[PDB]
Design a protein around this ligand. Structure first.
Ligand SMILES: *[C@@H]1O[C@H](CO)[C@@H](O[C@@H]2O[C@H](CO)[C@@H](O[C@@H]3O[C@H](CO)[C@@H](O)[C@H](O)[C@@H]3O)[C@H](O)[C@H]2NC(C)=O)[C@H](O)[C@H]1NC(C)=O
Ligand SMILES: *[C@@H]1O[C@H](CO)[C@@H](O[C@@H]2O[C@H](CO)[C@@H](O[C@@H]3O[C@H](CO)[C@@H](O)[C@H](O)[C@@H]3O)[C@H](O)[C@H]2NC(C)=O)[C@H](O)[C@H]1NC(C)=O
Ligand SMILES: *[C@@H]1O[C@H](CO)[C@@H](O[C@@H]2O[C@H](CO)[C@@H](O)[C@H](O)[C@H]2NC(C)=O)[C@H](O)[C@H]1NC(C)=O
Ligand SMILES: *[C@@H]1O[C@H](CO)[C@@H](O[C@@H]2O[C@H](CO)[C@@H](O)[C@H](O)[C@H]2NC(C)=O)[C@H](O)[C@H]1NC(C)=O
Ligand SMILES: *[C@@H]1O[C@H](CO)[C@@H](O[C@@H]2O[C@H](CO)[C@@H](O)[C@H](O)[C@H]2NC(C)=O)[C@H](O)[C@H]1NC(C)=O
Ligand SMILES: *[C@@H]1O[C@H](CO)[C@@H](O[C@@H]2O[C@H](CO)[C@@H](O)[C@H](O)[C@H]2NC(C)=O)[C@H](O)[C@H]1NC(C)=O
Ligand SMILES: *[C@@H]1O[C@H](CO)[C@@H](O[C@@H]2O[C@H](CO)[C@@H](O)[C@H](O)[C@H]2NC(C)=O)[C@H](O)[C@H]1NC(C)=O
Ligand SMILES: *[C@@H]1O[C@H](CO)[C@@H](O)[C@H](O)[C@H]1NC(C)=O
Ligand SMILES: *[C@@H]1O[C@H](CO)[C@@H](O)[C@H](O)[C@H]1NC(C)=O
Ligand SMILES: *[C@@H]1O[C@H](CO)[C@@H](O)[C@H](O)[C@H]1NC(C)=O
Ligand SMILES: *[C@@H]1O[C@H](CO)[C@@H](O)[C@H](O)[C@H]1NC(C)=O
Lengths: 68, 404, 184
């Protein structure tokens, strides 16, 4: 937490560094909060950025009504 | 007769800075005397760390709950046309890599060792994404998107829906639609000027930040005091005095620092309860005035509340309450009922109004003359028990059209 | 647990420490112990007061929900469960309450086209409670939820001014009741 990890697999985060897990570029649902948009889960242990659900933009126009 | 639309700002803080305090290293820097004497007080500093971790987890839960109230994020269409409603300084600008609207950019620019300052779980990027998604959901899905799957409704008809829900007939919206759009743009410009002008409008966030910084500064200042002992230095007494002879001095020092840490933690704890209550109130405000329109008055801004814009802010949330401000009053004469052909008549939803002798009907908060007909009235009782009733005829529909 | 700690004194015992120590220093030991135990009790009751205040605030919110969700229907959005609230069924719980929330979640969305108003015979048309909706060359009216097409008549619509300034307005014929019953 907080301290720079030049002094003390190794992954550099905003809140310090993480030892024991590998960082991936994909997105997963957050289970273990870490801080500054980092979340970890075990499937081996990995770390990933915060995923805010799924991106979904509904169609918008000058005349389009939706009634269930 | 004529109405204007203004916008106000409400700032409610959300989450203070999380602080983590270790006991042993705060009491003394790497000394074995504290290791062999702090446990003689029992597990005292353990519950302090337990309480501070509890504050950290409830602050994280609070800042998660105050914003993440949607299951899916919403993205604006690339076409910026909204039927005359220009949203440029409200919609986030993709030119800046941080994806911020200029209003919260100006608000961010205006608002400014054994301790540990933990970073928040949500940084400003995901808060900006939350505000952008909520703004998109409240502009393109109307007021019905939190009850289930996403819908789409164009802007003018859901303006008409909100005007119907506020207590006026929806026909008056299209009469001055461009006037309402121009007044909205002028109000957005004026509130941007007010945000850029007033320096004390954001006093709550600066107040809580200054309170936390001042508490930490007084903690640090009172740490370096002697507390009635010989030396104020943490480790100079280890070599200057015999460790048999330093027991009373180190006991007084550790109990004084323990009392100071206890009163600091209680003050912080109380404040933490206050900021949790304030952020819960802000969460109720967002859940009432953003997720759909509300009918209760004087809750979100001054006047009749239509809808609000939530925007990002450091350690808080700022709202843009869009209100209905009536004006252009005019004196008129009224009557509770009208008696026609020996039978009493009552208004369906409005009131009988007459400038001179000609009587007309109109809605509650807007003035427009209408012909008194049968379809907007009913017969119940006679014109004998009522008071203040006037005498006038009622024009009967379907009377002069069925004769031929 | 905090009772068993000596708090920097000789021992945690009370009666036995008086026998082995003289009263001039036993009063010092008892003074240290009494101050430390008073501090521990003060910490415990500070936690008790703050927990009582937080629980009282949460229970006042729970009582507001008790008088708002259970007593009748509350129109306010997502204050009693997720989505629109209709009714709630509370059950007895130890040191708490539990809430059910009968809600209304529509689904199976279908695309449709609309119009702000209808211009016909030099006058504007506006629905009294419904909304204009269409699928193709035929137009209908419906409510906010659970789409139900109906023929446009004069009882669910009204007239307000002329059709010149309303943007996006489109022609549509109107079926006026009592028109074919004129010569009977
Ligand atoms: C109170 O307001 C009402 C509503 O405007 C006024 O009634 C209006 O009175 C004028 C003049 O008497 C009417 O104008 C006339 O219209 C007929 C229509 O064919 C036209 O042929 C005449 O040459 C004349 O222009 C107007 O129609 C009438 N409006 C309504 C809705 O009945 C009334 O005069 C006002 N009273 C006072 C004291 O200001
Ligand atoms: C949009 O929805 C409306 C409402 O359902 C559709 O109108 C209805 O369409 C059906 C099927 O074409 C019509 O049924 C037909 O009726 C004739 C007698 O007129 C009969 O001989 C046929 O065998 C068939 O049953 C129905 O009459 C019609 N309703 C009205 C009032 O005309 C419309 O077709 C839909 N449009 C599109 C583009 O989907
Ligand atoms: C209504 O029509 C629009 C067309 O613009 C639909 O929007 C697209 O629908 C397709 C098929 O479902 C998707 O693959 C696209 O991603 C949608 N685009 C956008 C921008 O949303 C819309 O889904 C239709 N709605 C309904 C209820 O059928
Ligand atoms: C209601 O108030 C608005 C606001 O002043 C009026 O709009 C003005 O209309 C005049 C005449 O067209 C323009 O010269 C002004 O520039 C408009 N004001 C603004 C701010 O754009 C409107 O006319 C008023 N309506 C009534 C019925 O009095
Ligand atoms: C919406 O309002 C904004 C705010 O005025 C408009 O932004 C202006 O754009 C012009 C042309 O690019 C610039 O000269 C101004 O300096 C901008 N004003 C600013 C930055 O405050 C924007 O053009 C408007 N959009 C529409 C569609 O009318
Ligand atoms: C409205 O008209 C009715 C009948 O045209 C009035 O009733 C009469 O009022 C006069 C004096 O006010 C009495 O002498 C009659 O006996 C009344 N007749 C009946 C059948 O009641 C009534 O007073 C008028 N009201 C107003 C406010 O002018
Ligand atoms: C239906 O819409 C059409 C055009 O969208 C209107 O037709 C025009 O009406 C104007 C004046 O009403 C005439 O001068 C034009 O010659 C018409 N053009 C055509 C191609 O017919 C029509 O008026 C609308 N119907 C109603 C009842 O308003
Ligand atoms: C850690 O130190 C290195 C120096 O090699 C520096 O480049 C880096 O920015 C530092 N990181 C933090 C978080 O201070
Ligand atoms: C993937 O993650 C690595 C982690 O070091 C990063 O350097 C790289 O830029 C990422 N790639 C993309 C496309 O984001
Ligand atoms: C809505 O109308 C404007 C004004 O002409 C137009 O520029 C825009 O493309 C339209 N949007 C549609 C048809 O989706
Ligand atoms: C209405 O009449 C009262 C009584 O004289 C007066 O004080 C008030 O100014 C009038 N209002 C208007 C709009 O004429």
């Amino acid at each position: 937490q907080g301290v720079n990890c030049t002094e003390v697999n190794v992954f550099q985060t905003r809140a310090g560094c993480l030892i024991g897990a590998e960082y991936v570029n994909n997105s997963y649902e957050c289970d273990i909060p870490i801080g500054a948009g980092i979340c970890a889960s075990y499937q081996s242990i990995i770390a990933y950025t915060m995923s805010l659900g799924a991106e979904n933009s509904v169609a918008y126009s000058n005349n389009s009504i939706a009634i269930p | 007769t004529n109405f204007t639309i203004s916008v106000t700002t409400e700032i409610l803080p959300v989450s203070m800075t999380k602080t983590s305090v270790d006991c042993t290293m705060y009491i003394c820097g790497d000394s074995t005397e504290c290791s062999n004497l702090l446990l003689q007080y029992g597990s005292f500093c353990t519950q302090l760390k337990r309480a501070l971790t509890g504050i950290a987890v409830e602050q994280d839960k609070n800042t998660q709950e105050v914003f993440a109230q949607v299951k899916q994020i919403y993205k604006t269409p690339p076409i910026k046309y909204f039927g005359g409603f220009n949203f440029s300084q409200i919609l986030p600008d993709p030119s800046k890599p941080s994806k911020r609207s200029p209003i919260e950019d100006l608000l961010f620019n205006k608002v400014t060792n054994g301790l540990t300052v933990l970073p928040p779980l949500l940084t400003d990027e995901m808060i900006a994404q939350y505000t952008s998604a909520l703004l998109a959901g409240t502009i393109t899905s109307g007021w019905t998107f939190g009850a289930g799957p996403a819908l789409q409704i164009p802007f003018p008809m859901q303006m008409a829906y909100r005007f119907n829900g506020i207590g006026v007939t929806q026909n008056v919206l299209y009469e001055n639609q461009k006037l309402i759009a121009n007044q909205f743009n002028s109000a957005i410009g004026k509130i941007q000027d007010s945000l850029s002008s007033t320096p004390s409008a954001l006093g709550k966030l600066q107040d809580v930040v200054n309170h936390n910084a001042q508490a930490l500064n007084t903690l640090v200042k009172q740490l370096s005091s002697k507390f009635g002992a010989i030396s104020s230095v943490l480790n100079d007494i280890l070599s200057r005095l015999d460790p048999p002879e330093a027991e009373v001095q180190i006991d007084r020092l550790i109990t004084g620092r323990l009392q100071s840490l206890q009163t600091y933690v209680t003050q912080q704890l109380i404040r933490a309860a206050e900021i949790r209550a304030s952020a819960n109130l802000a969460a109720t405000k967002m859940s009432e005035c953003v997720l759909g329109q509300s009918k209760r008055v004087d809750f979100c801004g001054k006047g009749y509340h239509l809808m609000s814009f939530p925007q990002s802010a450091p350690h808080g949330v700022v709202f843009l309450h869009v209100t209905y401000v009536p004006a252009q009053e005019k004196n008129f004469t009224t009557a509770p009922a009208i008696c026609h052909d020996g039978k009493a008549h009552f208004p369906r939803e409005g009131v009988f109004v007459s400038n001179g002798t000609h009587w007309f009907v109109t809605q509650r908060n807007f003035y427009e003359p209408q012909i008194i007909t049968t379809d907007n009235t009913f017969v119940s009782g006679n014109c004998d028990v009522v008071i203040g009733i006037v005498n006038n005829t009622v024009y009967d529909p379907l009377q002069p059209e069925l004769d031929s």
